[PDB]
Amino acid sequence: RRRKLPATIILRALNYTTEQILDLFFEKVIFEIKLQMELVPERLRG
Amino acid sequence: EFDAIKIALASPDMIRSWSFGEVKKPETINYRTFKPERDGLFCARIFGPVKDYECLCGKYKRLKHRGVICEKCGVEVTQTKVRRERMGHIELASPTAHIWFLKSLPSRIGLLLDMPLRDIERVLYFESYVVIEGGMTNLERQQILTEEQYLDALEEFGDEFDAKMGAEAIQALLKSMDLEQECEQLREELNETNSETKRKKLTKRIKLLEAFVQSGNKPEWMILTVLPVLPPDLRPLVPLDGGRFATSDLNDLYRRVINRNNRLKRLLDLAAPDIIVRNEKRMLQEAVDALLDNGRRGRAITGSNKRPLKSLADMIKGKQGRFRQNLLGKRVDYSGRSVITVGPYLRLHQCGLPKKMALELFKPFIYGKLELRGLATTIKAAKKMVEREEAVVWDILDEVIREHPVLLNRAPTLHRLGIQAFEPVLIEGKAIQLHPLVCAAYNADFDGDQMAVHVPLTLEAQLEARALMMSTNNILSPANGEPIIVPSQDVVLGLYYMTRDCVNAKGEGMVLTGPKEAERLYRSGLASLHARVKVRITEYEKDANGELVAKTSLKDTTVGRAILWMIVPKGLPYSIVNQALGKKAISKMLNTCYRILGLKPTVIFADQIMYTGFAYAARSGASVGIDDMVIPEKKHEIISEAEAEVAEIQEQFQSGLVTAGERYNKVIDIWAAANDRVSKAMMDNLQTETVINRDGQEEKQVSFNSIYMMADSGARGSAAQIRQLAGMRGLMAKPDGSIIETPITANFREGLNVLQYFISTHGARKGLADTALKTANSGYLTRRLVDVAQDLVVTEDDCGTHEGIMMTPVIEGGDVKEPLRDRVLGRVTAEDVLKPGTADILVPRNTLLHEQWCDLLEENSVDAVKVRSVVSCDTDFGVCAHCYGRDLARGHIINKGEAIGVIAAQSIGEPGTQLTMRSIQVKNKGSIKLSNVKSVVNSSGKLVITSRNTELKLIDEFGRTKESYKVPYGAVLAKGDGEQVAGGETVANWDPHTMPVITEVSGFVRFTDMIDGQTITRQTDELTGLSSLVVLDSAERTAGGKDLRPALKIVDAQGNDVLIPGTDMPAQYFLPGKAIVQLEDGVQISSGDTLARIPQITGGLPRVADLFEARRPKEPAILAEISGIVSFGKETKGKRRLVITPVDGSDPYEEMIPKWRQLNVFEGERVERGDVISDGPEAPHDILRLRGVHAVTRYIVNEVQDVYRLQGVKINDKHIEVIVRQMLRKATIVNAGSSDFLEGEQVEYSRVKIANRELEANGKVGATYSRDLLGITKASLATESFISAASFQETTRVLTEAAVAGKRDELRGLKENVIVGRLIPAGTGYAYHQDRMRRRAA
Amino acid sequence: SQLKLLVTRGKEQGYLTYAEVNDHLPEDIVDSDQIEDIIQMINDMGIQVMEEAPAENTADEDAAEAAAQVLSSVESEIGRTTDPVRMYMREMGTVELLTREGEIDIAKRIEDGINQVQCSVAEYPEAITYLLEQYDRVEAEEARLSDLITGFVDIDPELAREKFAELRAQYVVTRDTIKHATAQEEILKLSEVFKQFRLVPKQFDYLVNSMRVMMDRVRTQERLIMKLCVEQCKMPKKNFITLFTGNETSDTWFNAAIAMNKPWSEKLHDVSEEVHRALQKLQQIEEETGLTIEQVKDINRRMSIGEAKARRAKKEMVEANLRLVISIAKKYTNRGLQFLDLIQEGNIGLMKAVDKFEYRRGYKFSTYATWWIRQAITRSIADQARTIRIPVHMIETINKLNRISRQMLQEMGREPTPEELAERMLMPEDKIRKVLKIAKEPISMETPIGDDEDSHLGDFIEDTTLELPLDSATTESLRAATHDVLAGLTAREAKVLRMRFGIDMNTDYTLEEVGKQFDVTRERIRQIEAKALRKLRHPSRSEVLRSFLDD
């Protein structure tokens, strides 16, 4: 019931890096360099 | 004895003057001899002897020594109760600041020193130094210096440097101050500081300094140097059983203070390091502040438990403090409670009292009367005689009780009829017997309720009980003049059964010689109570100057009606008992008796009605059985049909033809129709029967079914409950407020299955939980309304004013829901009521309009009477009897000394647990009449609405309005003024959307500044391709056109520019954005043609509460702050601008109309002050300013009576105007004039009113002002008495403000005389106070 | 800013939730009480904390504006603390600790200061006469030999008597040898031989105080002269420095300064009498001193310097020792006395230690104090912790019993009995019951005893010293009946009865005074009284008076 602070603080208090946080929460879109990108049909739903 | 209570700060000399000695030891009593110690908090040589007339050593023990100081201990020998009055004192080792004057939010110490609270606290807790008259060495007075800064500044400054720390520094600052010189400097500064904030601050501070100078105090008294000590008996150390002791929490606080003071004194003599002494001084400050007010700045202080200790401030404030609890809510002698039973044999002035309860309540009277007749030689003998309950004691008791009223009271006293006086009748048993006709007044039933009984002692109290409070004097409701002693449920059933005919009964067609023969025939069994016969009836009428002329005729009536005629008094007609006589007929009959004959006949008649009803209700043998609940024969068929319809709708929905939201409503409507059909079938099968006959033919008559008889007579129940008994239970709800689609199709004659019962449980618990909230919220409103209006009293006979309200019937669209008689009855006329022919005066003036006058007004069919109102009375500090009206509980003009404010508050508040928080088609026939109507002939000759305040009223043949319909702007009326209409004759029609734009004359139109693609867009109908130019708003249109204003001025075929017909100004009608210009550019049009087509309350108790608290509506309607011509200017500035350049006056008035608003005034239009510009909920404050005081009172009474009328409650409008009079009683001054008031100041209206009236009689001019409207809370907050205000406000804030101001209280309100314990200046005590004022003027 | 944002909603809704307030709260770290302070500050303009999401406004704007200004200050604040204990820790956390060698320097500074003070008081040897007189009175058996003096700087009474005899011999050979060149040497030798003695602190302090009283009398005379010659006459200070200083005894500086042909000299004529009286008092006192006042003045200056050095010395010792007491005090937090109170009581025991500590014995202070501190905390907890004070002895006994009882319960699995407690202890059993009755702390009279009407315990305690109203009516009835039965008698006998008993009067006169007025010798007046009594005794004159005889 104290003052609130951003959630990510606790994750960093659990020995987590930004890379790991993003790996856990967000998915990944790859890009290649011409300037080609791999496409997944399901990703571009709209 | 005393005539005022003055309050001020106490000087140390005064505190030593109070005291009888100094407390020096934290000791209380010895732990073996439990005797008081020498110099402790319970000493006997300072606070007095612990036993009456005895020393402590014991040498002096007999009264013969009263008044000497024993030298073995110095304990004066006197009464021990002197220990309840003597104070002591404590000499503090260091000055300490009073917490009230240091930590009250305005912070009087800081306000007086012009120093922020943080600096004061820092200097106070030894955090930093300060400069006290630094002198001529570069120092600044009241300059904060940290410790190191003080050290380094002390260097190179051999001068004293006048720096100090702690409360002694603050005391030096206050002591060195001079107030008169500060006033002089502040005046000099105000001479040449004409800046808003700066001059405001200077005026505030000079006001405060002048007030302090007048009060007589000295600022250095806010710093404590001596501490008073309360007398011991108010903080006792009482011994309990088993050796335990109970003590007051003040002893702990005093011991803390004394211990720390002694430690500080001892530590000063040891020359300790300054850290220790500073810490000790901080502790002493904390202890004193905890004593005076615990936990106000610190966290708290706790004793053995974890509860905070109770301090001196905690004993006055709170809801349990003395200034509250004890002083108006204390326990009383000569009283007792018990359970109440019926006692149907009693008369209205008598109550049954248990003999045992009366042998106790009247004990001293019995002792006196025994000793006076010689039965008992002395009082101890009498005490043993009554204790043994001898035979003579009962006779003496019967003699004592003979004529001696007793007050009976039931728990929630919601109005003044909750206490009433009765004559006792001694009875056996232990329960009180209560006359049935009084129950409605008490809201009492006989399922376990209890009542309290008090006995008046003095002669005056007995006379007041007999003359003011007796139950036979109070038969009318003070809220409305209607009788409150009407027969309730079983009397109604009996009287309904008695006077009720049937087709063919014994002794039909007989001819009787009178009521006596009818009764003789019924009791002998020769005739039925329902037998249509002919009876010779004699009736008297006062068709003269009170003569009672008799008329004998042969009436057609039943036997029961003729029998019932025997109890009716003379002056009444025969048609009153010649009907079925349900619940309301009986109340009407009692009211007729009261208004024609008087009070004693009414009381006798009411008792006779009760007796007869009870007798014949017993006689009928009415009962309730299971066959009495007749279920319709077609119920199941209706349910099957509705189930089929809902199934068809459901299967269609499953096919995706109807959305779920719409099918929900479809099913709801289907089930509502089914429920209505079932109820109609049930009620039609229940309410009629077939009986055969006089000749042998079928005949229908009203049913004698017991349930229908109870419901029809009004005895108990209603059709809604019979519906749940014989029909279907109906449609329930949900916890979310939604309505469950499937209803409970079973009734209680059948059974509910487990699912239906589970559904019903929710509603039940919801209702049970609500009721309580309603009760708690109605109490709040009543408390607040008596706080505001308590001291309003009738104090005069006739102020002699000529102004008042204009009463006319209130009509909401269709029918009239309150005629003129109800609104005008009992009031006094302000002007002569001219006969509708304008011939002569019908009622001259100053005539109390009683029933005869109201009948005359109805005869003359006049529907507008000007009556005198309380809110517009010229009396000062009170109201006159003529501006009030009549009592409504007594039936005559009010008397001087009447607490009309308490009556008004109770009348408004008591009916509040019964309030639940929820084109024109001329129906009747009459000559339509129009008001504020502007129009021009249309193409077909039909009228066109050219006014925003147009009104249409179906004036009837006599000229009396019967309907009032607001006429929407831009619409055409088929008929015209004077054109008779009929039913469904839609007088006019208009677009439910899109406000139309009309012109005035037929002519071509130029789209000047209406450039397409610049100011407008070519939105020509895409499908029909019909020109649809649309005005573009600043952003919508090009920036160049953004400044340009779209105009469609009319132009003649001559190529000239048409000027507004009838006006020099050209016929330009600028169209705003979104304007639908379906008309082609530069196209000729007709007169008033559609130049364009611009596109398109809570309820219940919370509604009443926020109506008295003057709350501004969230979307306040905007009005015409001034009369003139509308316009506009710098737009897009977040808020569009407007102006009303007065025709001749200047100051066109600019306003920040929020753009999201929807105006109702064409950019080119004239308006009058108090005219709607936008539209929505009106604000009471606007109405008072633009429109007069009479126009805000009319709004509040009508707005607050809608809540009550909707719920069937009936309370008079007198009571709402006395509350409104108390809301607008402060006035803001506009021009100081020749008076002695500043301009931007608020003063009592009654004060400015008399100040300039006296000034006007002299050779000067008055001061103008603008009235103010306040809610019932702020209005209350403005009381000029710190004792009355300390009762219902914050006691700490009230007493600190009054002490620094040196205020004085002179007891003249009702709440300050109750606390002090003397006669209130209202009722029987209104003559005492007047003679007191006479002697004081002497 | 942040606070203003918090206000924004407060007003917009008219209420707020604990969470939203705590969050919008300025990051400004707050020590709980501070948060408590601001909550009310916000409550000043009026707001609903309501740990959960939600009844009228009655707040004066003046309160509102003031609360707004103080609210702004809260943000600008840095370390505002409204807590005494916290303030104490901070003001104490500003003095460094001392190492082992750090008390030796302080101790030697103290010893040097006290030695200087002793010599300075020693220089003024007039007291030696008072010491000799006290010794003579003691040898007259008025007091104990060892009470007057705590030995000498040497161990037997005979040696002390020999030293006293030598001191008296030197005193008599020096006093009667003033006739000046060698008298100073004799006085110095007398002082040196007196230095070898040791005096009790009380007698030494009394001598010092008597000397201070004499010096203050001399200073009062000098200041009276200064105020009568400067304020009234505007006498230049240069004249005073030139004349008064240098001789300080004769009247030449004042009486013979009247002929200086100056206005102040002439104005001194009016005030010559009082200044002359002051000079006469000084001459006598100067003779009593028998020493140059300037020398004395320097003696007092040196004594003051030594005392100040000693005081500031211990000051620092006691600042590090305040650094302490906080530890021992925390060991009694819940003993019935408040923590800051315990700490302040310990600080006094600490001061007592520092003044009675000898570093020569090389005791760790932190040990010649951790005792003096605990003794002072416990003495207090015993003398001012209970509303009804108990003697230290009774408190010791009660604590002993409460212990002996715990052990007996643990080894008996049952509370002991007043009999078994008496056996285990050494008490006559009845004493145990008396000590087991000393009622514990008085109950709070505001203890909630409710659930029906919110009534407190003190509401149910009745008044037992009130006269019932049927006893006040009965009293007036007898005060009357007596008048009837008595009036139904002749004058002289009625007055005899009235005086004997005191009916309608202010004293129960004895027979002697009644006879004085009625002229007689008791036995007759006794005779008149008895007839009356036997008379009022028979029935037909004592039925109602009989009724008043409770039966």
Ligand SMILES: CCC[C@@H](C)[C@H]1CC[C@H]2[C@@H]3[C@H](O)C[C@@H]4C[C@H](O)CC[C@]4(C)[C@H]3C[C@H](O)[C@]12C
């Ligand atoms: C729970 C409601 C509060 C109230 C009913 C409770 C709370 C504490 C109780 C008192 C204390 O124990 C101290 C005494 C103990 C003695 O044995 C009997 C009396 C004594 C006053 C108690 C009576 C009662 O029981 C009290 C007031």
Ligand SMILES: CCC[C@@H](C)[C@H]1CC[C@H]2[C@@H]3[C@H](O)C[C@@H]4C[C@H](O)CC[C@]4(C)[C@H]3C[C@H](O)[C@]12C
């Ligand atoms: C509902 C709360 C119970 C409350 C009514 C009960 C519980 C304990 C009772 C008190 C204690 O006995 C201590 C005192 C004993 C004296 O002899 C009479 C007063 C005294 C206060 C008692 C009156 C009353 O009986 C008390 C308050």
Ligand SMILES: [Mg+2]
């Ligand atoms: Mg009931």
Ligand SMILES: [Zn+2]
């Ligand atoms: Zn005595």
Ligand SMILES: [Zn+2]
């Ligand atoms: Zn009037």
